[PDB]
């Protein structure tokens, strides 16, 4: 899976958060921007064959499933110190 611009998601969540009047953080991003991207990315994983067999109720045996992710970020003038990067 390729996430085209986790930066523009962070920007959309910031807009939603501020319109809802939640308290702003650094650069005005809400604090749960780390929680947003971390809960999203830790979903990409490889799972052992016991998990696959348990999930598919026995149909598939002997196979490990996997999801790979390639998030993309834009930095401004190469600044890595900004919040979302």
């Amino acid at each position: 899976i390729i996430y085209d611009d986790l930066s523009k998601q962070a920007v959309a969540y910031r807009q939603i958060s501020l319109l809802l009047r939640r308290p702003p953080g650094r650069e005005a991003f809400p604090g749960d921007v780390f929680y947003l991207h971390s809960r999203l990315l830790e979903r990409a994983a490889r799972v052992n064959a016991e998990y696959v067999e348990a999930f598919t109720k026995g149909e598939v045996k002997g196979k490990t499933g996997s999801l790979t992710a390639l998030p993309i970020i834009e930095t401004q003038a190469g600044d890595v110190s900004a919040f979302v990067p």
């Binding site: 799972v47 998990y51 999801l67 993309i72 970020i73």
Partner: protein, 85 residues
């Protein structure tokens, strides 16, 4: 008046999505007819736990010499592509 349907956001999922351009809610926008989904799934779920993982030892090939020699990606990895515009 607003009613409260007690159900979280779910999305069409299946094999019939391969080749289809879809909006966030699962509506096709390519105009090639309706989907053929294998049921729905929930948008917001939790990830597999520590015991349910397996280590990464299988490659996913980029095809680019620089990436695939110096910065290899495996099936379950979470590689970040970062830079300017």
């Amino acid at each position: 008046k607003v009613k409260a349907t007690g159900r979280i956001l779910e999305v069409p999922v299946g094999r019939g999505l391969l080749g289809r351009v879809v909006n966030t809610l699962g509506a096709p926008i390519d105009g090639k007819g309706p989907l053929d989904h294998d049921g729905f799934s929930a948008v917001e779920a939790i990830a597999p736990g520590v015991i349910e993982r397996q280590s990464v030892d299988q490659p996913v090939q980029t095809g680019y010499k620089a990436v695939d020699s110096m910065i290899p990606i495996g099936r379950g990895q979470r590689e970040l592509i970062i830079g300017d515009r």
